[PDB]
Structure 1
């Protein structure tokens, strides 16, 4: 209940710390199923410096707004596009929703001209798509053509091509690093289909965008295509600094091929900004720029390939103990086949091991973020073996 009298700073901080003590902490070897991790320590100072900024009012924070533009330019350069137009937004969800808004407004323009027989935008989406695409469908009344996945759990490119011939398609979604298994759709083929048919293509690289460009060749697999960025001519890319960019939440990224896409993000206010949010942090842009500058490609390569080394270690231990990984890992994600995954996950949770559950297959998914070290993997294998005894 709200009280008349205030309390002391010592009282309220001690209470909050008690609540914090009930949380898990990334560095304690409990969290195995999350795509967030410890932030780069430098970002704590940056959050402090930029706490009292608001990119919803950029005319008041000219320098913080410039840092957002510079963060976007660095991400754009990483993705092979020196002219990208974009924003440092609240996360991959808002990023994906903005792309969907752009796809919808391109369709709206067509409908206004009689150039579309679709009463709602028709968008081809793989069934591996993150839940944010369902939030967008539900809110924006989109019509999704769900694309099946092949045996390697990547989108069926022939289905997409056939569907594009069969229907009037307003967008195609490809995923560069799926949530459950870390697989990479064949963006190169999808972008060829999209370009040939003049269809908008969005790449969801929320997770993979800050991993794929840094992978050592020994982790790359023959036959797997790792191309996903603006070198393929795609229209937009979601990329999430607060996942494998080690930035504090909220630090999401949305990049469009060029500034011509901005007009399709406009909103008509008859009695009255491209982001969905209004008031919004300025420290995400500052952190995204600073972390990429501080690390350079070299520093991020080191972190990414350390994670991959621990990922292949876990893969190795899993097989050595007769567990069946769903696939040989593509990114720093491994999943364990198990018909009894629901209950094994709950048994793991009761022993202090928190994994996530897949949807496209009966399995436990582990995300080997930088906080997962070899000793945590050893401890995980012991606890799981025991659960199975």
Structure 2
């Protein structure tokens, strides 16, 4: 119920006021909530959530939004600027992701986020495989670690999703993937890296598996697309993961993540225009005129595409290199510190999204102790663990040292009381062992709580 802390701070609104409220009063309330909320992400207490977070970069993008606020890309005749920004965002991302190696046929679109990029990629493989291979019962083979949006795509578009086991390094077991391929498989996927444990899947081998079966290979680089090319140039071990690989037929990369654009954008890329074409929706007989959508949406907030273009141009190759170096050096420091705490262990060998578990202590209480110190960490299960996705906010002076000091104490306090399960720890413990319908019932109730007006 700390998800509803303004219940007794600001007046609630279940109905429109009769008279319009003063603009200065609306602004005062919003700024007051900003004063309460901003320190958590600004001062480096949030895992992921805010990727850049510098006040001058934010002020720069807020100005870009302001200049382009009326932009709706559904009307390129009215906003040709925005069509230019989206075309250039896609062209620049494709090039960064080995697009020239594919022969200059790499194309794509700007989306509302990573989820849309993954859903669109799944719908496209389903539609392409039906029209060209005649598959009417589509299947998709992905590792267990692959994004929850794959499950969302399966249920929405009627694709059978086959999730395959991981190895001891929390990487996709490719042999398990090969064994799951049937004549109905439309796509195989790999994560670069996956969200739970920040490990990069063996993409060259996943791409070669797809190529030999004549199926799609989607690379989910939503998290790593804007990190991994720079990590490669810096001396860090990163296998080829993009269009440089022959079997790779699509890549998703989030401009609103490490691209450092404003929330609300991502990029979906395909190796060829013939694949891209299956993503489009075209209505030819509607009295409202000829209608064509490249993505899920009709009307779109064009100003957010402009923030993505403005962010990429302001950073350039050097900015992205320098941002990755900072993130990866902060990650190296954090990994070394965690590995020096006796009761903790890191899952796999990640470069910057660090999952921490314990064979000795209840990691959910260790996590709860951190929450008690203001840390906002992602809680994981299968296995129980928490993770920290390092951002530019965690590269600021003293943030990693503050995390390490607070983790040292958290472990000590749980080592003294291993029975302690306070706050959110029993919920996470319950959740990890709960049957799916109990999880479904509790999640439905949590979403309903978010929409409560009192």
Q: Deviations over 1:259-296 (max 9, x none)?
A: 22232123354642120011112233323333222222
Between 51-60 and 258-267, report the one with greater CA deviation.
Answer: 258-267
Pairing 1:229–2:245 present? no
The answer for the alignment partner of 1:10 in structure 2 is: 24
Between the two structures, name the one with larger relative contact order (CA 8 Å, sep ≥ 6).
1
**Conserved? CA contact 2:170–2:348, under 8 Å:** no
Structure 1: tracts of 5 or more residues without a match: none
The answer for the alignment partner of 2:74 in structure 1 is: 56
Output the CA distance in 2 between the equivalents of 1:202 and 1:121: 15
Q: Deviations over 1:14-60 (max 9, x none)?
A: 11122223324422232135364426343222112111101122232
2:231 paired residue among 203, 215, 231 = 215
**Conserved? CA contact 1:33–1:354, under 8 Å:** no
The answer for the alignment partner of 1:129 in structure 2 is: 146
**Conserved? CA contact 2:117–2:266, under 8 Å:** yes
Alignment of 1:177-256 (within 5 A): 177-215=193-231, 220-221=236-237, 225-233=238-246, 234-256=248-270
* Pair 130,37 (structure 1): closer, same or farther in 2 beyond 3 Å: farther
Alignment of 1:136-155 (within 5 A): 136-155=153-172
Root-mean-square deviation (CA), in Å? 2.1
1:103 paired residue among 125, 138, 152 = 125
The answer for the alignment partner of 1:168 in structure 2 is: 184
Q: Deviations over 1:103-123 (max 9, x none)?
A: 110122146xxx43xx42110
Output the CA distance in 2 between the equivalents of 1:238 and 1:83: 16
1:199 Cα deviation (Å)? 0.3
Output the CA distance in 2 between the equivalents of 1:30 and 1:142: 38
Output the CA distance in 1 between the equivalents of 2:17 and 2:300: 30
1:125 Cα deviation (Å)? 1.1
**Conserved? CA contact 2:346–2:355, under 8 Å:** yes
1:175 Cα deviation (Å)? 0.7
Alignment of 1:1-389 (within 5 A): 1-25=15-39, 26-34=41-49, 36-38=51-53, 40-41=57-58, 42-81=60-99, 82-110=104-132, 115-116=134-135, 119-164=136-181, 166-215=182-231, 220-221=236-237, 225-233=238-246, 234-267=248-281, 269=283, 271-272=285-286, 273-327=293-347, 329-338=349-358, 339-372=361-394, 373-389=396-412
State the SS of the aligned residue for 1:260: helix
Work out which of the two has the higher radius of gyration on C-alpha atoms and give 1 or 2: 2
Output the CA distance in 1 between the equivalents of 2:314 and 2:52: 18
Structure 2: tracts of 5 or more residues without a match: 1-14, 287-292, 413-454
State the SS of the aligned residue for 1:58: coil
Q: Deviations over 1:338-368 (max 9, x none)?
A: 2512232223212211111223422110111
Paired residue total = 380
TM-score, normalization: structure 2?
0.79
TM-score, normalization: structure 1?
0.91
* Pair 151,134 (structure 1): closer, same or farther in 2 beyond 3 Å: same
Between 196-205 and 358-367, report the one with greater CA deviation.
Answer: 358-367
Output the CA distance in 2 between the equivalents of 1:196 and 1:29: 45
